[PDB]
Amino acid sequence: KVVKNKAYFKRYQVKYRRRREGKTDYRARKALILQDKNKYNAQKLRFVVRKTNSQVICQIACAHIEGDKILAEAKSKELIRYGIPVGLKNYAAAYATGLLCARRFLKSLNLDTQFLGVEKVTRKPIKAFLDVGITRTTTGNRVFAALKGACDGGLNIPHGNNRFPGSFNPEQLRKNILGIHVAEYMKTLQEEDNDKYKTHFNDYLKNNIGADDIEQMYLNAHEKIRQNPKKLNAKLRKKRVKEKLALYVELQ
Amino acid sequence: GRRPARCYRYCKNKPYPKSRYCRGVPDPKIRIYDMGRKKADVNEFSGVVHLVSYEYEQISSEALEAARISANKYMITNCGKDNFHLRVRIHPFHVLRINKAFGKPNGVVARVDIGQVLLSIRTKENFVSKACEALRRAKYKFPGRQKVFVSNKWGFTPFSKDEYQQYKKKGRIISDGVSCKFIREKGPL
C-alpha cells in the first residue's frame, strides 16, 4: 500500500503553522501567556531569547489577540556599535545582549533612573518571564546568560540558579560573562596546535583581540551599554498545458 | 425451516446487520450475485433491462436466490450462456430474528426502496425481449410490485447509448470489464 493516499490527505490535520515550521511550543507558550483571568489588563511581559546560529535575539513581548507586540528588542549584532566585534554567540555576548535589551525597555518606558540594578559584575522591579522556546535548558545555557544580563539591568526575571555554569558556582558565571572561558580556550589553542588556533579564531585575530584584552573589552562594552541605548492565473496555465501537449504530439 | 415471508415483508425494525453485535447469524443463501459472461467487455453488450421494485419492502435472501436461478436458467434455455450478464444489484445485510423476549437471528433480507433496482441484465441488443421475459419470470418470485424496465443506458455504465457512441468516437472513455472509466482532463501526464 502507498501510505500517502488521497484518503490520508483528506483525513490529515495540519499542525499549527509555527509548530509545523518547528519554532514554537504552543503548550509552553499558552502557559507562559495566560495569566489569571481575574487580573484583567495585566499584560504579562515575556522576555524572548533566541539563540540563532550567529546572533542572539532578545525581545520583550506583550501578547494580544491580534498578534504579539514587541516593546523592546536587541540583537547581538548591535554590539559592534558598543565596541565589541566578533564572538556574538558567546555567553558573554548573550549576557550583554540581554542587558542591552533590558536597558532599551527601560528607556522606552521612561523609567531608567529608578532601575539601575546590579552595577558592574559580581519601587518594585519590572517583572518578566523567560521564553526560552524550543532550545532545551541545560546548565550553562546561553539564554540563561541573557536572562542574567537582563536581571543585572532592571528586570525582575524570576529564576533559579541551577542553570548557571557549574551548578551554585558564581565565580564560573562571572568568568563566563567576562569571556574568560573563551580566553582560556584561546590560550590553550595557542599553546598546542597553532595552525588550528589561527584557523579557528580568525576574525578575532584579524580584529587584533588577544586573550588578555577580551575581558576588558567586554567590560567596556557593558559600560557603554549602561551609558546609553510571480504567479500565473488559470488561462496562462491552460495555455502552458496546451503547449506541452502540442510538443508531445510533435515528438510523437 | 422457515416463515411465510409476509412476516418479514415490510421494513419495520431498523437495519440490523452482521457485526460485533450479532455474531451467530447464518449465511445468505445468495452467494453468486452476478452470472452469465461476467467477464464481458463494455462494448460487447448494449441492451440493458432493469427490474425495478416500486415498493418499500424487504425481499428474503432465499427469494432473491430463486429469482436469480429463474433468470439464469431461462436465459440459458433461450439465448446462449455467454450472450448476457445478469447482475443482482441488491444484497441481503439486514438480518431477521425469531422468538420461540428479544429474538435470536434467523435469516437475512435485502431491504429496498421505491426507486431502486433488483436485477439488471446486460445483453446484446438482439436478445432484449428474451431478457425482459426472464426478468418478468423472476418477478413472480419476489414479493410486491416490481416493473421490468428497459433502459436508455449502454449497460450498467451510466451513459446513454448515443452518448457512449460519441465518447467512443472521440476516445474519452476507457473500457475495463463491465465498468468503463470516463477521462476527465484532470490528472498529471
Partner: protein, 124 residues
C-alpha cells in the same frame, strides 16, 4: 561540494541469545574493537551495539571490509562477520532531518539512493 556523500554513521551490531554472560563477552569484544562503551538492546536484553562517527568509523569500516544486493533502496549498506556492520551514508545537511529546532525533510535529490551509494563504494 556540499553534495559529497560522507559516511554518516557506522553501527556494529551483535545479536546473541538472551544475556547469559555471552552478551557481556560480546560487549567487551565490541569495546576492545572500538573505543565506545557499548549499549544493550531489549526483548520485545538480547543484543549489543555501538554507533560510531567520523574518522574512527571510517577506519572500522576499512578494517571490517576484510555485493550489489547488500545496499538498501535508501542508499545505506551492510555486511556481516561475530558482528554485523551497517554503514548509513549521508550528505552534508543531514542535520536538518534530526535537529530539535526547525526539523525538516530532506529533498529527494539530496537523499543518497542505491546507485549513488554503489558509486561511492567503488570510489573508496
Amino acid at each position: 561540494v556540499m553534495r559529497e556523500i560522507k559516511v554518516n554513521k557506522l553501527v556494529l551490531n551483535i545479536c546473541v541469545g538472551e544475556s547469559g554472560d555471552r552478551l557481556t563477552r560480546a560487549a567487551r569484544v565490541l569495546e576492545q574493537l572500538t573505543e565506545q562503551k557499548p549499549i544493550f538492546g531489549k526483548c520485545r536484553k538480547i543484543s549489543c551495539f555501538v554507533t560510531v562517527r567520523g574518522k574512527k568509523a571510517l577506519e572500522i569500516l576499512e578494517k571490517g571490509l576484510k555485493r550489489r544486493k547488500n545496499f538498501s533502496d535508501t542508499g545505506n549498506f551492510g555486511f556481516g562477520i561475530g558482528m554485523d556492520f551497517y554503514v548509513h551514508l549521508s550528505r552534508s545537511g543531514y542535520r536538518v532531518t534530526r535537529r530539535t529546532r526547525r526539523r525538516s525533510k530532506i529533498s529527494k535529490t539530496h537523499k543518497v539512493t542505491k546507485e549513488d551509494a554503489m558509486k561511492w563504494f567503488q570510489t573508496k
